[PDB]
């Protein structure tokens, strides 16, 4: 049943994501272990979610989902994850919706 290398390996590597300003960004990924606890880092910095945070790390089976509430020109950064035995990186580019936002 559950027989895999000691550490954890990122089966599915993050993929470049292009969202708009204020939009909601969602980074999905998969690992070797289940209900694991990956570490999401923004441009090398360690993210710290919570009841009063912007980033919300969700765990679903053997896949993680890093959602970002309000993706501004600042949110657009290289998001890299770190596990017990794996690491990944992605590029998030934020675009400012063109045209008058009406109707």
Can you give the CATH number for the domain in which 49 is found?
2.60.40.10
The overall longest dimension of the chain from CA atoms, in Å, is: 56
According to the entry, how was the structure determined?
Answer: NMR
Among residues 45, 24, 27, which one has the least CA distance to residue 94?
A: 24
Cα-only R_g, the chain: 15
In angstroms, the Cα distances linking 84 to 15, 53, 66, 78 are 21, 24, 18, 20
Say if residues 80 and 3 touch (Cβ distance below 8 Å): no
CA distance 40 to 87: 10
- Fill in the DSSP letter of residue 43: T
Tally of structural domains, the chain? 1
Domain, as residue range, for 10? 1-103
């Amino acid at each position: 049943g559950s027989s895999g290398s000691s550490g954890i390996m990122v089966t599915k590597q993050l993929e470049d994501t292009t969202a708009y300003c204020g939009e909601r960004v969602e980074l999905e990924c998969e690992v070797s272990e289940d209900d694991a606890n990956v570490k999401w880092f923004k441009n090398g910095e360690e993210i710290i979610p919570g009841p009063k945070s912007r980033y919300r790390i969700r765990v679903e089976g053997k896949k993680h989902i890093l959602i970002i509430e309000g993706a501004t020109k600042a949110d657009a950064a290289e998001y890299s994850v770190m596990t017990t035995g794996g690491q990944s990186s992605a590029k998030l580019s934020v675009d400012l919706k063109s045209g008058p936002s009406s109707g």
